[PDB]
Amino acid sequence: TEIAYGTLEAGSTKEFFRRSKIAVFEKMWTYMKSAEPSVFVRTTEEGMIRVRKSKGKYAYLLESTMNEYIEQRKPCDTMKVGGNLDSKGYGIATPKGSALRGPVNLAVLKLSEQGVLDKLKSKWWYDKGECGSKDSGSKDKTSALSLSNVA
Amino acid sequence: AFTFAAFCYMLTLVLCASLIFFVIWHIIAFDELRTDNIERICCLLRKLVVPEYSIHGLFCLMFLCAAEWVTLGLNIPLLFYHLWRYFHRDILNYCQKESWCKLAFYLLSFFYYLYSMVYTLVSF
Amino acid sequence: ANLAAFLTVERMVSPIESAEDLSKQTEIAYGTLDSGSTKEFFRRSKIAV
Protein backbone atom coordinates (compact mmCIF):
# COMPACT_ATOMS: atom_id res chain seq x y z
CA THR A 1 0.00 0.00 0.00
CA GLU A 2 3.00 2.35 -0.01
CA ILE A 3 2.77 2.90 -3.79
CA ALA A 4 -0.55 4.17 -5.16
CA TYR A 5 -1.41 2.73 -8.57
CA GLY A 6 -3.79 4.46 -10.96
CA THR A 7 -5.03 4.20 -14.53
CA LEU A 8 -6.59 6.37 -17.24
CA GLU A 9 -9.62 8.44 -16.26
CA ALA A 10 -11.81 7.21 -19.15
CA GLY A 11 -10.41 4.23 -21.03
CA SER A 12 -10.59 0.50 -21.61
CA THR A 13 -8.50 -0.23 -18.51
CA LYS A 14 -11.00 1.41 -16.15
CA GLU A 15 -13.88 -0.46 -17.80
CA PHE A 16 -11.98 -3.75 -17.48
CA PHE A 17 -11.29 -3.30 -13.76
CA ARG A 18 -14.94 -2.37 -13.16
CA ARG A 19 -16.10 -5.73 -14.59
CA SER A 20 -13.23 -7.95 -13.38
CA LYS A 21 -14.66 -10.69 -11.14
CA ILE A 22 -11.25 -11.79 -9.85
CA ALA A 23 -10.16 -11.54 -6.22
CA VAL A 24 -6.74 -10.29 -7.35
CA PHE A 25 -8.31 -7.49 -9.40
CA GLU A 26 -11.32 -6.85 -7.14
CA LYS A 27 -9.26 -5.62 -4.17
CA MET A 28 -7.33 -3.36 -6.56
CA TRP A 29 -10.55 -1.81 -7.88
CA THR A 30 -11.93 -0.95 -4.43
CA TYR A 31 -8.59 0.64 -3.51
CA MET A 32 -8.48 2.77 -6.66
CA LYS A 33 -12.16 3.70 -6.26
CA SER A 34 -11.62 5.42 -2.88
CA ALA A 35 -8.43 7.46 -2.60
CA GLU A 36 -7.67 11.01 -1.45
CA PRO A 37 -4.97 11.76 -4.10
CA SER A 38 -5.57 11.60 -7.86
CA VAL A 39 -5.66 7.94 -8.90
CA PHE A 40 -7.06 8.73 -12.37
CA VAL A 41 -5.36 10.80 -15.08
CA ARG A 42 -7.10 12.13 -18.18
CA THR A 43 -4.04 12.29 -20.46
CA THR A 44 -1.61 9.38 -20.68
CA GLU A 45 1.28 11.85 -20.92
CA GLU A 46 0.21 13.68 -17.76
CA GLY A 47 0.25 10.35 -15.93
CA MET A 48 3.69 9.60 -17.36
CA ILE A 49 5.32 12.72 -15.92
CA ARG A 50 3.43 12.02 -12.69
CA VAL A 51 5.27 8.69 -12.42
CA ARG A 52 8.60 10.34 -13.24
CA LYS A 53 7.94 13.00 -10.57
CA SER A 54 6.65 10.59 -7.91
CA LYS A 55 10.01 8.73 -7.89
CA GLY A 56 8.67 5.33 -6.88
CA LYS A 57 5.21 6.34 -5.64
CA TYR A 58 2.84 6.14 -8.65
CA ALA A 59 2.54 2.93 -10.69
CA TYR A 60 0.66 3.68 -13.90
CA LEU A 61 -1.28 0.81 -15.48
CA LEU A 62 -1.25 0.96 -19.29
CA GLU A 63 -1.01 -1.40 -22.25
CA SER A 64 2.14 -3.38 -23.03
CA THR A 65 2.98 -1.78 -26.39
CA MET A 66 2.56 1.78 -25.10
CA ASN A 67 4.63 0.95 -22.01
CA GLU A 68 7.51 -0.50 -24.03
CA TYR A 69 7.55 2.49 -26.39
CA ILE A 70 7.40 5.09 -23.61
CA GLU A 71 10.28 3.26 -21.89
CA GLN A 72 12.58 2.91 -24.92
CA ARG A 73 11.64 5.73 -27.33
CA LYS A 74 11.65 8.27 -24.46
CA PRO A 75 14.19 9.30 -21.81
CA CYS A 76 14.30 6.06 -19.83
CA ASP A 77 13.75 7.14 -16.24
CA THR A 78 11.02 4.49 -15.86
CA MET A 79 10.82 0.80 -16.73
CA LYS A 80 8.28 -1.98 -17.20
CA VAL A 81 8.10 -4.71 -14.56
CA GLY A 82 6.00 -7.87 -14.47
CA GLY A 83 3.93 -9.68 -17.06
CA ASN A 84 0.65 -8.81 -18.71
CA LEU A 85 -2.41 -8.98 -16.47
CA ASP A 86 -4.97 -9.73 -19.19
CA SER A 87 -4.62 -10.73 -22.85
CA LYS A 88 -5.71 -8.59 -25.80
CA GLY A 89 -4.82 -8.31 -29.48
CA TYR A 90 -4.75 -5.73 -32.26
CA GLY A 91 -6.05 -6.38 -35.76
CA ILE A 92 -6.85 -4.73 -39.08
CA ALA A 93 -10.52 -4.60 -40.05
CA THR A 94 -12.68 -4.93 -43.17
CA PRO A 95 -16.31 -3.93 -43.92
CA LYS A 96 -18.91 -6.60 -43.18
CA GLY A 97 -19.30 -8.80 -46.25
CA SER A 98 -16.35 -7.65 -48.36
CA ALA A 99 -14.06 -9.59 -50.70
CA LEU A 100 -10.96 -8.08 -49.01
CA ARG A 101 -10.98 -10.32 -45.92
CA GLY A 102 -9.71 -13.70 -47.13
CA PRO A 103 -6.50 -12.72 -48.94
CA VAL A 104 -5.88 -10.02 -46.32
CA ASN A 105 -6.11 -12.55 -43.48
CA LEU A 106 -3.77 -14.90 -45.35
CA ALA A 107 -1.26 -12.07 -45.81
CA VAL A 108 -1.28 -11.23 -42.10
CA LEU A 109 -0.62 -14.84 -41.10
CA LYS A 110 2.11 -15.08 -43.75
CA LEU A 111 3.90 -11.97 -42.45
CA SER A 112 3.62 -13.15 -38.84
CA GLU A 113 4.97 -16.60 -39.78
CA GLN A 114 8.00 -15.35 -41.75
CA GLY A 115 9.26 -13.36 -38.75
CA VAL A 116 8.47 -9.97 -40.30
CA LEU A 117 6.30 -8.46 -37.56
CA ASP A 118 8.95 -9.31 -34.96
CA LYS A 119 11.56 -7.52 -37.08
CA LEU A 120 9.39 -4.42 -37.54
CA LYS A 121 8.66 -4.31 -33.81
CA SER A 122 12.32 -4.66 -32.81
CA LYS A 123 13.21 -1.89 -35.28
CA TRP A 124 10.66 0.72 -34.19
CA TRP A 125 10.75 -0.08 -30.46
CA TYR A 126 14.44 -0.87 -29.83
CA ASP A 127 16.52 0.17 -32.85
CA LYS A 128 15.15 3.74 -32.64
CA GLY A 129 14.86 4.40 -28.91
CA GLU A 130 15.64 7.78 -27.38
CA CYS A 131 18.07 6.70 -24.66
CA GLY A 132 18.90 3.51 -26.56
CA SER A 133 20.12 0.36 -24.81
CA LYS A 134 22.95 1.56 -22.57
CA ASP A 135 24.85 -1.47 -21.22
CA SER A 136 22.63 -4.06 -22.88
CA GLY A 137 24.30 -6.72 -20.74
CA SER A 138 22.42 -6.42 -17.46
CA LYS A 139 25.00 -5.78 -14.73
CA ASP A 140 24.40 -8.42 -12.06
CA LYS A 141 23.86 -7.09 -8.54
CA THR A 142 27.29 -7.58 -6.96
CA SER A 143 26.79 -8.95 -3.46
CA ALA A 144 30.27 -7.79 -2.42
CA LEU A 145 30.79 -4.37 -0.86
CA SER A 146 31.68 -1.63 -3.33
CA LEU A 147 34.71 0.62 -2.93
CA SER A 148 32.69 3.85 -2.77
CA ASN A 149 31.01 2.66 0.44
CA VAL A 150 34.34 2.88 2.31
CA ALA A 151 35.86 5.64 0.18
CA ALA B 1 34.47 7.69 -9.58
CA PHE B 2 36.57 5.41 -7.36
CA THR B 3 38.98 3.03 -9.10
CA PHE B 4 42.10 1.20 -7.98
CA ALA B 5 44.16 3.31 -10.38
CA ALA B 6 42.70 6.50 -8.89
CA PHE B 7 43.86 5.41 -5.43
CA CYS B 8 47.31 4.52 -6.76
CA TYR B 9 47.63 8.05 -8.15
CA MET B 10 46.72 9.41 -4.70
CA LEU B 11 49.46 7.52 -2.84
CA THR B 12 52.03 8.78 -5.36
CA LEU B 13 51.41 12.43 -4.45
CA VAL B 14 52.26 11.71 -0.81
CA LEU B 15 55.26 9.53 -1.72
CA CYS B 16 56.72 11.55 -4.61
CA ALA B 17 56.88 14.60 -2.34
CA SER B 18 59.30 12.66 -0.13
CA LEU B 19 61.42 11.84 -3.19
CA ILE B 20 61.65 15.59 -3.85
CA PHE B 21 63.38 16.17 -0.51
CA PHE B 22 65.98 13.51 -1.33
CA VAL B 23 67.14 15.06 -4.61
CA ILE B 24 67.20 18.48 -2.93
CA TRP B 25 69.36 17.21 -0.06
CA HIS B 26 71.68 15.67 -2.66
CA ILE B 27 72.33 19.07 -4.24
CA ILE B 28 73.09 20.50 -0.80
CA ALA B 29 75.55 17.65 -0.21
CA PHE B 30 77.19 18.31 -3.58
CA ASP B 31 77.38 22.05 -2.86
CA GLU B 32 79.12 21.45 0.47
CA LEU B 33 81.85 19.31 -1.11
CA ARG B 34 82.32 21.87 -3.89
CA THR B 35 83.02 24.68 -1.41
CA ASP B 36 85.62 22.63 0.49
CA ASN B 37 84.49 14.77 7.68
CA ILE B 38 84.50 14.10 3.94
CA GLU B 39 83.51 10.49 4.60
CA ARG B 40 80.54 11.70 6.66
CA ILE B 41 79.01 13.58 3.73
CA CYS B 42 79.62 10.65 1.38
CA CYS B 43 78.36 7.93 3.74
CA LEU B 44 75.20 9.94 4.43
CA LEU B 45 74.72 10.08 0.66
CA ARG B 46 74.88 6.28 0.46
CA LYS B 47 72.19 5.96 3.13
CA LEU B 48 69.93 8.37 1.24
CA VAL B 49 70.13 6.85 -2.25
CA VAL B 50 68.78 3.44 -1.19
CA PRO B 51 65.29 4.59 -0.06
CA GLU B 52 64.98 6.91 -3.06
CA TYR B 53 65.47 3.99 -5.45
CA SER B 54 63.25 1.62 -3.45
CA ILE B 55 60.34 4.07 -3.21
CA HIS B 56 60.38 4.58 -6.99
CA GLY B 57 60.23 0.80 -7.32
CA LEU B 58 56.72 0.96 -5.87
CA PHE B 59 55.70 3.59 -8.43
CA CYS B 60 56.54 1.08 -11.17
CA LEU B 61 54.71 -1.64 -9.18
CA MET B 62 51.54 0.20 -8.13
CA PHE B 63 50.70 1.30 -11.67
CA LEU B 64 51.46 -2.21 -12.94
CA CYS B 65 48.52 -3.59 -10.94
CA ALA B 66 46.46 -0.46 -11.69
CA ALA B 67 46.40 -1.11 -15.48
CA GLU B 68 47.70 2.45 -16.05
CA TRP B 69 50.39 1.55 -18.58
CA VAL B 70 50.32 5.05 -20.10
CA THR B 71 51.98 6.30 -16.90
CA LEU B 72 54.38 3.36 -16.46
CA GLY B 73 56.19 4.40 -19.64
CA LEU B 74 57.02 7.71 -17.94
CA ASN B 75 58.78 5.86 -15.09
CA ILE B 76 60.52 2.89 -16.77
CA PRO B 77 63.51 4.95 -18.05
CA LEU B 78 63.94 6.32 -14.52
CA LEU B 79 64.24 2.79 -13.12
CA PHE B 80 66.66 1.80 -15.90
CA TYR B 81 69.06 4.51 -14.72
CA HIS B 82 69.06 2.93 -11.25
CA LEU B 83 70.41 -0.29 -12.78
CA TRP B 84 73.53 1.52 -14.00
CA ARG B 85 74.17 2.75 -10.44
CA TYR B 86 73.96 -0.79 -9.03
CA PHE B 87 75.80 -2.54 -11.88
CA HIS B 88 78.97 -0.42 -11.58
CA ARG B 89 78.69 0.96 -8.01
CA ASP B 90 85.51 15.38 -12.79
CA ILE B 91 82.98 13.34 -10.82
CA LEU B 92 81.79 16.56 -9.15
CA ASN B 93 80.63 18.09 -12.44
CA TYR B 94 79.19 14.74 -13.56
CA CYS B 95 77.20 14.12 -10.37
CA GLN B 96 75.98 17.73 -10.40
CA LYS B 97 74.45 17.35 -13.87
CA GLU B 98 73.17 13.89 -12.88
CA SER B 99 71.24 15.43 -9.95
CA TRP B 100 69.66 18.59 -11.38
CA CYS B 101 67.75 16.46 -13.89
CA LYS B 102 66.35 14.42 -10.98
CA LEU B 103 64.73 17.49 -9.39
CA ALA B 104 63.15 18.47 -12.72
CA PHE B 105 61.99 14.94 -13.55
CA TYR B 106 60.59 14.22 -10.08
CA LEU B 107 58.67 17.53 -10.26
CA LEU B 108 57.24 17.42 -13.79
CA SER B 109 55.92 13.91 -13.15
CA PHE B 110 54.64 15.09 -9.76
CA PHE B 111 52.20 17.46 -11.47
CA TYR B 112 50.90 14.54 -13.54
CA TYR B 113 49.56 12.73 -10.46
CA LEU B 114 48.08 16.07 -9.35
CA TYR B 115 46.09 16.21 -12.63
CA SER B 116 45.69 12.60 -13.77
CA MET B 117 44.02 11.85 -10.43
CA VAL B 118 41.44 14.58 -11.05
CA TYR B 119 40.88 13.14 -14.54
CA THR B 120 39.34 10.09 -12.82
CA LEU B 121 37.69 11.30 -9.59
CA VAL B 122 35.44 14.10 -10.88
CA SER B 123 34.89 12.19 -14.16
CA PHE B 124 32.26 9.98 -12.48
CA ALA C 1 29.02 -6.51 9.03
CA ASN C 2 29.00 -7.65 5.40
CA LEU C 3 29.86 -11.24 6.34
CA ALA C 4 27.01 -11.20 8.87
CA ALA C 5 24.63 -9.80 6.25
CA PHE C 6 25.67 -12.55 3.82
CA LEU C 7 24.91 -15.57 6.02
CA THR C 8 21.66 -14.03 7.29
CA VAL C 9 19.66 -13.75 4.05
CA GLU C 10 20.47 -15.29 0.66
CA ARG C 11 19.69 -13.83 -2.78
CA MET C 12 20.32 -16.40 -5.52
CA VAL C 13 20.03 -14.89 -9.00
CA SER C 14 19.57 -16.83 -12.21
CA PRO C 15 22.66 -17.16 -14.46
CA ILE C 16 20.56 -15.97 -17.44
CA GLU C 17 17.65 -13.60 -18.04
CA SER C 18 16.74 -13.84 -21.75
CA ALA C 19 17.56 -15.60 -25.01
CA GLU C 20 19.58 -12.69 -26.45
CA ASP C 21 21.94 -12.93 -23.45
CA LEU C 22 22.75 -16.65 -23.61
CA SER C 23 23.53 -16.30 -27.33
CA LYS C 24 26.54 -14.11 -26.44
CA GLN C 25 27.97 -16.00 -23.45
CA THR C 26 27.72 -19.43 -25.16
CA GLU C 27 28.61 -21.12 -21.85
CA ILE C 28 25.39 -23.13 -21.37
CA ALA C 29 24.60 -25.73 -24.03
CA TYR C 30 20.90 -25.26 -24.84
CA GLY C 31 18.84 -27.76 -26.81
CA THR C 32 15.51 -27.89 -28.63
CA LEU C 33 13.14 -30.49 -30.09
CA ASP C 34 14.28 -32.69 -32.97
CA SER C 35 11.42 -32.00 -35.41
CA GLY C 36 8.61 -29.55 -34.70
CA SER C 37 7.64 -25.90 -34.56
CA THR C 38 10.72 -24.73 -32.64
CA LYS C 39 13.20 -26.39 -35.01
CA GLU C 40 11.41 -25.11 -38.11
CA PHE C 41 11.21 -21.62 -36.59
CA PHE C 42 14.92 -21.53 -35.72
CA ARG C 43 15.78 -22.92 -39.17
CA ARG C 44 14.27 -20.11 -41.27
CA SER C 45 15.05 -17.13 -39.03
CA LYS C 46 15.96 -13.73 -40.46
CA ILE C 47 16.93 -12.09 -37.15
CA ALA C 48 20.61 -12.30 -36.21
CA VAL C 49 20.17 -13.55 -32.64
Binding site: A144, L145 | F7, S18 | -
Partner: peptide, 28 residues
Protein backbone atom coordinates in the same frame (compact mmCIF):
# COMPACT_ATOMS: atom_id res chain seq x y z
CA UNK D 1 32.40 -9.56 1.90
CA UNK D 2 34.94 -7.19 0.30
CA UNK D 3 35.30 -6.70 -3.44
CA UNK D 4 38.56 -7.62 -5.14
CA UNK D 5 39.20 -3.92 -5.80
CA UNK D 6 39.33 -3.26 -2.05
CA UNK D 7 41.72 -6.13 -1.27
CA UNK D 8 44.17 -4.67 -3.78
CA UNK D 9 43.71 -1.24 -2.17
CA UNK D 10 44.37 -2.52 1.36
CA UNK D 11 47.73 -4.12 0.57
CA UNK D 12 49.09 -1.02 -1.17
CA UNK D 13 47.69 1.21 1.59
CA UNK D 14 49.40 -1.03 4.16
CA UNK D 15 52.79 -0.80 2.43
CA UNK D 16 52.15 2.90 1.82
CA UNK D 17 51.51 3.61 5.49
CA UNK D 18 54.56 1.52 6.37
CA UNK D 19 56.92 3.40 4.05
CA UNK D 20 55.44 6.73 5.16
CA UNK D 21 56.11 5.83 8.81
CA UNK D 22 59.64 4.73 7.88
CA UNK D 23 60.27 8.05 6.12
CA UNK D 24 58.92 10.00 9.10
CA UNK D 25 61.14 8.01 11.48
CA UNK D 26 64.14 8.88 9.26
CA UNK D 27 64.23 12.69 9.26
CA UNK D 28 64.62 12.67 13.06
Amino acid sequence: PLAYEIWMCIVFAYIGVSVVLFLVSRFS
